[PDB]
Amino acid sequence: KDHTIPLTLISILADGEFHSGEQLGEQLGMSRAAINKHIQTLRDWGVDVFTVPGKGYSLPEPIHLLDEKKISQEIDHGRVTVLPVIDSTNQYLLDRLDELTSGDACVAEYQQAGRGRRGRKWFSPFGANLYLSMYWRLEQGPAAAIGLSLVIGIVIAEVLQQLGAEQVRVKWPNDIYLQDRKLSGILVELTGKTGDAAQIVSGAGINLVMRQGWISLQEAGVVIDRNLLAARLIKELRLGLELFEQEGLAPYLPRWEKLDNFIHRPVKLIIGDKEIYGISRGIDAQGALLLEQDGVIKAWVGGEISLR
């Protein structure tokens, strides 16, 4: 049944402040007697309404109304948007940083300008692979994005493992590997201030279809509906990040050890155009890379790990 007028009426009084029959009549476009009549319906609904005689109405105390969007977000800790065509899922969230909350996600079917790490281009054919991005605000500094990327790699690799691909491994600071071949590229981008929060948009591109250095989930004997895989990743990533927010990197230290593709192996550390050679010894308790050169282990807080 149409209850539009009483429902609009209660939303104007939900603040608990004083509301005059004249102002109500202006907003609702109704007479003062009819405004009173629709106040009368509300009291028949069990709403306590105070009637100041001749001046207007007020609620005893402010009331907060039910909202689908508010309820869903607390259920979800984030929204999801599907884009058929976009330049990049990372760029879509980056363009809307002022309006995002931690957990907001974004999946695309086709990326017109998918981006890699070093200015590389991510080939994103329509409806073939997964092109996902999610936003997260870290109250810790921009240096917390290292743990961000490490947690993301652990979560993504774990989710793939529960779906069949038991030999999926991670790469410091962000990539997913399988049989020493790149299966998914992660691109974590950040704008922040030291001593303050950091807004992070992380984007994952997972090779699902085959089309020497690259591998696909099809080549692993794993076939998944993209909607199911995307939903599982968004759900698990959201849970992993809030755990990282409240407990830090400590829960993920044993998990990184089980998943590191390059631990105790000869690797290449890439910073700028430099190339540092050594044996990887995992990560430290703060997510810094532990790289052994000539028997000496030094901690690195930046760069990329490569194969040798």
Ligand X SMILES: O=C(O)CCCC[C@@H]1SC[C@@H]2NC(=O)N[C@@H]21
Annotated binding site: 88-90, 111, 115-117, 182
Q: Is 70 a catalytic residue?
A: no
Looking at the Cβ atoms of 39 and 165, the one nearer to ligand X is 165
Instruction: State in angstroms the smallest separation of the CB of 84 from ligand X.
Output: 15
Q: Is 120 a catalytic residue?
A: no
Gap between the Cα atoms of 158 and 259, Å rounded: 9
Looking at the Cβ atoms of 110 and 214, the one nearer to a copy of itself is 110
42 binds a copy of itself (CB under 8 A): yes
Q: Is 121 a catalytic residue?
A: no
Q: With CB under 6 A, what is the number of residues at the site for ligand X?
A: 20
Among 156, 186, 267, 291, which residue sits at the site for ligand X (rule: CB under 6 A)?
Answer: 186
Instruction: State in angstroms the smallest separation of the CB of 173 from a copy of itself.
Output: 27
Binding mask 221-260 for a copy of itself (x = CB under 8 A): ----xxxx-xxx-xx-------------------------
Edge-to-edge strands, sheet with 130-138? 80-86, 105-111, 130-138, 198-206, 181-192, 176-178, 168-170
- Please name the helix (run of DSSP H) or strand (run of DSSP E) that holds residue 307, with its range, or none: strand 304-307
Gap between the Cα atoms of 79 and 81, Å rounded: 7
Which of ligand X, a copy of itself, none sits in contact with 186, Cβ below 5 to 8 A by type?
Answer: ligand X
Which of a copy of itself, ligand X, none sits in contact with 82, Cβ below 5 to 8 A by type?
Answer: a copy of itself
Binding mask 106-145 for ligand X (x = CB under 6 A): -----x--xxxx--x-x-x------xxx------------
Gap between the Cα atoms of 76 and 79, Å rounded: 7
Catalytic residue among 32, 96, 117, 137: 117
Q: Please, are residues 278 and 293 in contact by the beta-carbon 8 Å criterion?
A: yes
Binding mask 288-307 for a copy of itself (x = CB under 8 A): --------------------
185 binds ligand X (CB under 6 A): yes
51: nearest Cα among 35, 73, 75, 30 = 35
For 47, the 3-state DSSP assignment is: coil
288: nearest Cα among 275, 276, 267, 305 = 305
152: nearest Cα among 185, 179, 107 = 185
Query: CA-CA-CA-CA torsion for 111, 120, 267, 249, nearest 10 degrees?
Result: -50
∠ CA 72-73-77, nearest 5°, is 130
279 binds a copy of itself (CB under 8 A): no
Site for ligand X in 35-94 (CB under 6 A): 88-90
Which stretches of the chain bind a copy of itself, using CB under 8 A? 1, 3, 7, 10, 14, 42, 45-47, 63-68, 70-76, 80-82, 84-85, 107-110, 123-128, 225-228, 230-232, 234-235
Which stretches of the chain bind ligand X, using CB under 6 A? 88-90, 111, 114-117, 120, 122, 124, 131-133, 185-187, 203-205
Query: Catalytic residue positions?
Result: 117, 182, 308
